[PDB]
């Protein structure tokens, strides 16, 4: 990739960009006719949020998503990976891609609650005080609708609402 560094010596600021090692795609894709790296390796409908090995290749060092025109993914699969990365951080599966903390900030101790398949941000969810009748039940969303067409090895389809 490319790196940017600034060195200040003698009240003079110098900004330079140095090229570092760039990783290379593995040769001989199973499906060279594929348009995006997903179906080139026949990974469509075959990855989940816990597959951090696939997700780590499309994220920045601070956990941010990469642009679609850089990775080369299609719009359909970029959105799926976008949600899988969000659910990976919320499950604590990417501990090395934490947000950058500015100097002079020490995070306080907060209730550590284990979670997974978390569709929404925890801070932006209101409690379900009234479940409602059986025919009008207020369900709790689990997972993501963007992963509905994934490969299911059981006869029962994925239940996205509990």
């Amino acid at each position: 990739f490319r790196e940017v560094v600034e060195t200040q010596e003698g009240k003079t600021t110098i900004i330079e960009g140095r090229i570092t090692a760039t990783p290379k795609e593995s040769p001989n894709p199973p499906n060279p006719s594929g348009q995006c790296p997903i179906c080139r390796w026949n990974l469509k409908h075959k990855y989940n949020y816990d597959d951090v090995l696939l997700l780590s290749q499309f994220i920045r060092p601070h956990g941010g998503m990469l642009p679609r025109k850089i990775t080369g993914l299609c719009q359909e699969e970029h959105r799926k990976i976008e949600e899988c990365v969000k659910m990976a951080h919320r499950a604590g599966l990417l501990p090395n891609h934490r947000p950058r903390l500015p100097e002079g900030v020490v995070p306080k101790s907060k209730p550590q609650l284990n979670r997974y398949l978390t569709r929404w941000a925890p801070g932006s969810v209101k409690p379900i005080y009234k479940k409602g009748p059986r025919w009008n039940r207020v369900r709790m969303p689990v997972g993501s609708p963007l992963l509905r067409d994934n490969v299911c090895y059981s006869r029962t389809p994925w239940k996205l609402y509990h």
Binding site: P30, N31, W41, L43
Partner: peptide, 8 residues
Amino acid sequence: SYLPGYVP
């Protein structure tokens, strides 16, 4: 060195 039906 990957078959046509290979999946990671």
